[model samples]
Target: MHPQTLEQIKESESQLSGRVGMVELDLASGRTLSYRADERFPMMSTFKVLLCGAVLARVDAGLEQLDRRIHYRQQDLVEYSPVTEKHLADGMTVAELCAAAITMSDNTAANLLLATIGGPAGLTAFLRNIGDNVTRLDRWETELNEALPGDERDTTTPAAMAATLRKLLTGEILSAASRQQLITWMVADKVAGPLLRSVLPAGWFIADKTGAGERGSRGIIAVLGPDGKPSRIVVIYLTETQASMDERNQQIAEIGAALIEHW
Candidate 1:
């Protein structure tokens, strides 16, 4: 949050061809750095993390079991569902579905988990329960990624994302086992490798979920820090640009570097 660190973040944002939003939280100290952190950006696949968290809440209440099998048919299939598409007939356990959704951004797996938690309204309700007043999910996958200018549907601010993630991962909002499970899924995530994690110095830890959509919109929600140090929550989002995926990735990676340099 230092002035010079803020300057570095602004410089990184300027290099990108889009409006950027970011918030970095030092979980150990509750310190934060912000830039356009309150602006709305599409949630995209990033909502899957919370979707599973809600499921875990239900588990905590004895209303759901992770080992329960969920059967689906061809009608359940959706685009980009590599994992779910392969197990239509045999069905998948709740835990397996959550893993596929987070690790691979599997769309159908996310939808199944969404339905298990009562879809968009149910997830929104969970956010409110956790005291997050800014985030909302009004649509399902692919559609949620519309990222239309000025539309607030299915969006979250960087500050809200970071706060909610911090609560789930470190706060007492979720039971210890569930929180650890969520962290496990995030650590196993396949999306961050080529983006934020790729740019960070070797040996740093990062557990994250990422999203992409139209208008060059992209984002990452992560718990990151240096070895042997307390981890910090970092949220970065980009929108309203025509940059290619490669360019967008570079912009986010640059922002990651600034965050590390300032940390």
Candidate 2:
């Protein structure tokens, strides 16, 4: 990372009305730009990435397939679900569930996947396997709505999230086929940050997952330029914003723009 770029990121972060943690990686060169990247923050639905990985590990172990069917009922209904709300009483494949979970951050879909992988304990083990034992998911999406003020929700640092993503993309943890499937789902998902993609130079493509909450939004995007040479990666993990939601979103857009230009 360039010293000038580091200063720029620091300056940008200093101007924010909230706490922000970010890390940008050049997939081709292994260079990185960082701003409080190692500090953990509440991840909200973005934590579903771990839940999805845990379920996929079972698939790779001959325990399940991406297309394996899981039954759904009223018990699975969640307020913002894109899957359970529509199906209400039907079943969906694991891949289908993951698509909904990652694409739109459907809480019902996330809970279903969590149940499939042995609840919080299973995900906890997976986190240890990935060497991110400090990160944790203490509540399911269903439980989140009713969580006590003192309860810990899902949390991770930008570096931890990036570590998992980098390994998955390089086929370090999952099989190449599984990696392809995961990234494919990520690439096709529609998300809340239109401006992040909008400011990009043409011929660039991003495959990412985004999470939203009352206080902040978290997003991780894997960028592939026209040359398709390196996979540039960026993580936007923000919290406790002093500004309104719309204004915070604008901050994130500016943050992403700075990363792409300076990277």
Candidate 3:
């Protein structure tokens, strides 16, 4: 399985004019495959999932309520999020914010929830507590106005994210209700899903988060297979491709096709 998965990943890597990283796992059988899975990359808006998890954890501890409304100030809005771009008024609940943050990659909702769940420090702490020490929310979402090179705020490795994802399904990190909400939001994610949508087979499903970086950095997707069954979970992170957008999109589609075929 490792060799076959490696071959498929290399197919995408070779097809690319730049670099790639992947981690494909059959957790039930302890079979895993990886390519530069340890390579760290900025997750961009993808970190919202982490923030969402932290919020869920808080909810379980009684510090926050999933249905509780979080006031949204006019100044809270930021660039890139499609959900809050309408100049939405205050009154979004924790569940609504988490939904928009992951489903639409809303920056304002992300920061609001980030602070509500304890900020970057708290996010890292929650993740570390769950065995993902390397993944970190380096800074706030709006702080990325003009991210300088080497600025790897809000980052994670393919392996780290895959692990965290698996935990989201099995670990005690989130209650069953919280986990279900997270999964429901991700499975319904329309903003960050072109790769997953156009690539894999129709029967297969994904609960994922997507993020784009300053320049050249385009996509990062984590597809949790069957939500932990029937086959496996696959994560693909594309960074600094130096390739055109269409080329990258096609490359992703090709990778997913190969992954589905191999699965």
Candidate 4:
């Protein structure tokens, strides 16, 4: 068994709020350590990664084409998503919508992609097909609507997310080319916040995504380090935060920086 260590970087006058869950995986050697990685937490937008898989599966099934265009109507707007505010005359292709959903965290675009891929149930099946049992997608919505109240909107483990990412990276979920395409979009649209990107070395190639909800936030950071190897795959999840987003994000960066230095 491998033991991990954690040292405090900084303590603020105000006590930081939220729970932190993380896992550091070495792809080549299979060395791993975790901080609360198995605890189930709200997944937020991070669940979109599963949607990414579902969409690619659809492309694989020949049920839909990536370049197929779909219209964006006013009624499809999701409150928490960025696509609602933008009013574009023309619709976007499946690939473009997926790119928007990942890069911009566009809620409407996610729902659109979800619908095209066969909804929540279909996504569940897709995940099972990939050997990931810890993740489940129950519904697709822009906001946490009371109408569809359940645990489905709010439960995932960091280890499960990391496992899913590993499968994607190893070309288990999609064709190698499709997986590479998804990684490309993830790098392009990853939420530009403090967690994984802040601690990395300059010019490192990182392909990842982020998710946040009312009281929870989660992100997965996968980077090719200076060694020209897949250096680290980290999953961080914070839930029930009493602190501001900035504070939580700062903590994420600090934790990530520690891993970079020591791991």
Top candidate when judged by lDDT against the true structure: 1
Q: Ranking by TM-score, best first?
A: 1, 3, 2, 4
Model 4, C-alpha of 157: deviation from truth (Å): 0.8
- Candidate 4 lDDT trough over 10 residues, lowest sum: 1-10
Look at candidate 4 and give me any clashing residue pairs: 103-189
Give model 2's TM-score versus the native structure: 0.88
Order the candidate numbers by lDDT, best to worst.
Answer: 1, 3, 2, 4
User: What is the lDDT, from 0 to 100, of the residue 23 in candidate 1?
Assistant: 88
**Candidate 2 lDDT by residue in tens digits, 83-116:** 6677665688889899999888888888888888
How high is the CA lDDT of each candidate model? Answer: 0.86, 0.70, 0.72, 0.69
TM-score to native of every candidate shown: 0.95, 0.88, 0.88, 0.87
Clashes (N, CA, C under 3 Å) per candidate: 0, 0, 1, 1
Residue by residue across 1-263, what tens digits does model 3's lDDT show? 22354676677677675667788877678577788889877777777777887788888899888788776666777776677655466568888888889888888888888888678888888889888888877688777423344555666788888788778755677999887777788778886545767765556667767766655555555655643433466777676666777677766666666666667
Deviation in angstroms for 53 in model 4? 1.8
Clash number for model 1?
Answer: 0
lDDT digits (tens) for residues 173-194 of candidate 4: 5887787778788778657656
